[PDB]
Symmetry: D2
């Protein structure tokens, strides 16, 4: 039952199953994973491919020699499995040099360094087949109000992403960028804290068509926002280039639970949206097997990410396919929602007396929305109780 | 001390000092205010002007006759005081007809009604001198996931705001629009939940130059976001057409405390930003005197809004003017933040070996940001302890 | 399927299905319900009984005459249905007189009034069969720090509940009290904000055995707390006298969605706990049919409360009954958790060298908890995917 | 100005100024501190003393030999400075062995190990002068609902703290225990998540008089609770044995900013309470100099903790001492709050017709609380604007 296959486009970061378990209050509980072993174990679980930070694949400060061997091993692992690399990203957060950010560090030389580090990995990403290069500004932010002039920092961020856009256009690369928003942690407040903020920022960039969002379930939920809604806005904008899936129990530290845990109902409405909107990008899991687990639990947890998506996909598909649900949708006027409000135009609307002077407001007010019955149908389907 | 004057551009909604105290669990504790009395009492407190929902000024369902007398009284009150009306807005939330929204109700006739109601008040707003017409989609949203197709709802919202833009362009009006974001309440999740989401949405509108944001201190804080940061992003985008000021104690129901209460430090960093960025629009207070107060407390609470802004303005101005602070700002490299990261261009950056190959990363990493000393200087100033 | 029967002990407040839909930003969308009609419609849905605030049953300021007719009608409705009244409570929040609280108002005469109002309804509750009298201090609190001396207010609250305890002991009543915690709303912060705070407070009361908690799913979740955990602590303390069930989507205004909505997984772990711990009190639904609904949706929403509990009860029972789950429970050492840590006593523990000097820490550290596999089994069961 | 002296009873954990800056997404930015250097630098800043986890002072797995030298060096540093050690605690969270908790690990041998580790450090704490031994159950909890039977875990926690109580009674030690609550992180939900929960739990212990709370500003605020209120409840209960001070910006990861940052107004109301209630225990700072800082910033940040307390203490003292404030307090009936509600007893209250039958409810309802004017006086004082 619910066995993932490569056509489900499930991908995992190297840093996910590879997470060693060091948290703010704790030492590592698992040994470091050879990226080659992760490629194989993930392929045996049915995954479509893998993603990486530069520093996951090539340890920081590697010689050109050692860099080459690390890439070669990895490429060989991709060969014998067919594993794809749809996305890659830069580690602009771990090293002490980035303690005040990468692209928006107050120190200018750190900003130039960040760009060179990113540009080097773009090349590697493009060679491996990456279609999206993700930017997560984990360190772009502040704990205190005087430490960052946010308008100047937005200048520096626009200038960085404008340079990366100019670079990929000069190389004729096909790769596109996706900003991964996060509201906070490890900075007190992170710039571009939500999907909305990243989407707005992209529109001031020089080549906005090159940039989209990589939203993460848990990150929007850390601001208490509705992740299915934010995704619909990203899709509405045409900017859902990529997506990070995982679990989060409300507003607290970034948990990165396996997808399906955390807000289960939101997970259902999310899968329902991706599937019914025809999202065709990677279903990427940016999660962490809890440090309570050993390696067996790491792989069970990763298997759980895909299984929960597949179960949810089946419940949503049956929900939409149900005639009582289709009848409930009309009863709640979801079909009227898709109708243009005034396709007769402004002037016709201004003269329409049934739109104001003769609008029976109390009759329209007394029409129940029948939202609760529709939602119990969704609940019944989610729980298999139909 | 700290006495507000009209040049401080402090404005209040009729619905603020006029709030009667009915909350979800409680009946009203104060009698309804005559809008004329509010105009006068606010002018006697030093306010610049007032704002209104249509339904604050003209009770719902008024005859053309009674509408005229309500407007005439109001206009006379503005005459004898000089009170301005910089902003007006539509009540698309109180009446039962809007229980599923205005511009994005599933019922199409309610959507057309909402537009006619808005368009009627636009005319009145323009006649009274309003420069901004605010849209707050309080009812645009859902409590459950199946009740609203968010992409279709975004279609309906874009079509509504496109029609309002077409209307004001046809009348040659000067007024501009400002979306007032709110993440939730009274809907479980409200569309365009934050400043970011509203800014992004505006860029898909047909005449984006006509639309900006009216951010509210408390609303961004209900998503746990940094209001001074979101404001800097709005200013960076050129979209801070208007601003709502008040207090909020973290993530919970919309409190609308008087400005200064709630997150005091955020209030300081906010005033510091508006003043140093040269914001020149209204300092509008969308707050509610707590229902524990009588009319004396209503007016003391409103006076508190302006007083706290003025005290904070003086502390921030002294903070910036302090030489130790200017020295602390350089010590934290805030001046380096304003410098272009790579004004020598992409190619020069690619060949700069001091940007990567010869970048001493450990030396840059060991340079402390001196952020804590700068913040204690800000704290010392805020508390008058210098 | 999943049809509730009186033996399921489902109860509803009069104020739940009877909620008219007035919220902070909105007028009522439904007409007021005759309490008699609610008793009948709820009995036809399979409910065990009803609960009430005094002011739900007898309108405020009723003559002794009119009070009598309202009680008589109600008692007749209970007769022809067999509906029980397991719990009643006082409205110490709606009337303007309680704007600063009931038992902890700063005004002493309001405090004495609150007690008389409560004591009058205790009598009525006891006559109707109530076993629990619930106290919700909705108005006990403050928006600002100087407005309430919290230690003095705790004195006044202890003195109130001590008087109610002295009253029920003098009348020889069997009824017991249950404090219903809420962290905020409509006050900025409410005293005894969580289950923990109420449990602690009870231990300083004069007859602690008379007092327990009435925890509400949504209220603990408004503080971001784990409701199943808090319930286990209440059960552990022997104080789960009663329970309020409903849905809440994280930290925001009190939503009071129907049980099952909001945090579905928490709902599952809750039902799993009540059932496996043998809770035998009322399954009380303190929810609100969203104001988008008409009367048909009110009753569908109420039916949804019971249906979701019953579905969840079946999933949890099957989860516990599953041999793979019982094997997973042992694999995660849940059975070792029930074992006394040192039943050999302090001295034996002090001399046990396998407890410290010869404890192989790295071997114990390398034993995975197998928590993820256990949780996917729970997920599989919840979703019917076994 | 505002220079701390030992009589201010300011203490710091070794792990605070000693925090190296490793966070979930980042490597350390500062070198490890010699505990001896920290004792001296803190004494030069005016601190009263220091606190430690066992593993801060003696590195894990130290020989009896090396343990002795580490303790000897430390004791010598305390000698030449006069620095006190008022509190010590056990590290039951860092080592991988504690990944599922200490006292409530599912593995029984880990639970016995935890107790032996705690008991060993109790001895050392008592020898150094510690009056409070703090328990922080950082790892007591779960990420998923099936992983922890919370009632069994409460059994194991009561049995652990009962054994520690039996141990200190057998040795005739004077030291008392203080539970340090935290709602979450690093576990998804931590047992005894708030002050309320810990206070309640203490009352089921065998010798409750030996146990109090060590509340942390930021931890209650991570549940969105009012820290000054929770402290008043702890004081009301007689259980404020100790207190952790720091800053937190709302509901998010545990920030541990320096005291004064985060919720400044709450900091003011906190100092106002500790001082006016006559708290005489340590003012302990459990904070972390942000990893952006070098060693100069570490010490400036620590100096900021004490300075902000001292500034706030002066503002609160002047607030209380102000005659307009004392007049405002009476105007808001804070003096009536301290009066017994019904010292005439139950029967007199039952017969008092001015308490119900002849209570003019509308007159009492129309008396404003004058809370806003009182709060602006507090604000004016806090900002030095009087
Ligand atoms: O940089 C991209 C990735 O970095 C990871 O370390 C973080 O956990 C993710 O939030 C992000 O997707
Ligand atoms: O519609 C504009 C205004 O409506 C008011 O009722 C709400 O309180 C505000 O959020 C908003 O500024
Ligand atoms: O007073 C008891 C009840 O009052 C109701 O109005 C509130 O909604 C509930 O929180 C509470 O259970
Ligand atoms: O164990 C006591 C201390 O441990 C520290 O590591 C944590 O940061 C604190 O929350 C706690 O006060
Ligand atoms: Mg991510
Ligand atoms: Mg507003
Ligand atoms: Mg309730
Ligand atoms: Mg602590
Ligand atoms: Mn994450
Ligand atoms: Mn608001
Ligand atoms: Mn509720
Ligand atoms: Mn902390």
């Amino acid at each position: 039952n619910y066995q993932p296959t490569p056509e489900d486009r499930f991908t995992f970061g190297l840093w996910t199953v590879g997470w060693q378990g060091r948290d703010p209050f704790g030492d590592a509980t698992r040994r470091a994973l050879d990226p080659v072993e992760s490629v194989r174990r993930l392929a045996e679980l049915g995954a479509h491919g893998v993603t990486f930070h530069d520093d996951d694949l090539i340890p920081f400060g590697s010689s050109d020699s050692e860099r080459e061997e690390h890439v070669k091993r990895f490429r060989q692992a991709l060969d014998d499995t067919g594993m794809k690399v749809p996305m890659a990203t830069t580690n602009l957060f771990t090293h002490p040099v980035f303690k005040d950010g990468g692209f928006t560090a107050n120190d200018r030389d750190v900003r130039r360094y960040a760009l060179r580090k990113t540009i080097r990995n773009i090349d590697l990403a493009v060679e491996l087949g990456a279609e999206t290069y993700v930017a997560w500004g984990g360190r772009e932010g502040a704990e205190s109000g005087g430490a960052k002039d946010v308008r100047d920092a937005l200048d520096r961020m626009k200038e960085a992403f404008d340079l990366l856009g100019e670079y990929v256009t000069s190389q004729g690369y096909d790769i596109r960028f996706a900003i991964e928003p996060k509201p906070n942690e490890p900075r007190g407040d992170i710039l571009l804290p939500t999907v909305g903020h990243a989407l707005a920022f992209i529109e001031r960039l020089e080549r906005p068509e090159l940039y989209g969002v990589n939203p993460e379930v848990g990150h929007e939920q850390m601001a208490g926002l509705n992740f299915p809604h934010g995704i619909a806005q990203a899709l509405w904008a045409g900017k859902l280039f990529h997506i990070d899936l995982n679990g989060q129990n409300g507003i607290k530290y970034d948990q990165d639970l396996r997808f399906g845990a955390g807000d289960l109902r939101a997970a259902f409405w999310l899968v329902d949206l991706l599937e019914s909107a025809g999202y065709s990008g990677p279903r990427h899991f940016d999660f962490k097997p809890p440090r309570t687990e050993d390696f067996d639990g790491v792989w069970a947890s990763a298997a759980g990410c895909m299984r929960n998506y597949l179960i949810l996909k089946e419940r949503a598909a049956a929900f939409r396919a149900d005639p009582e649900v289709q009848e409930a949708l009309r009863a709640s006027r979801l079909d009227e929602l898709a109708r243009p409000t005034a396709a007769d135009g402004l002037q016709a609307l201004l003269d329409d007396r049934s739109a104001f002077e003769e609008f029976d407001v109390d009759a329209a007010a007394a029409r129940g929305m029948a939202f609760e019955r529709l939602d119990q149908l969704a609940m019944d389907h989610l729980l298999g109780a139909r």
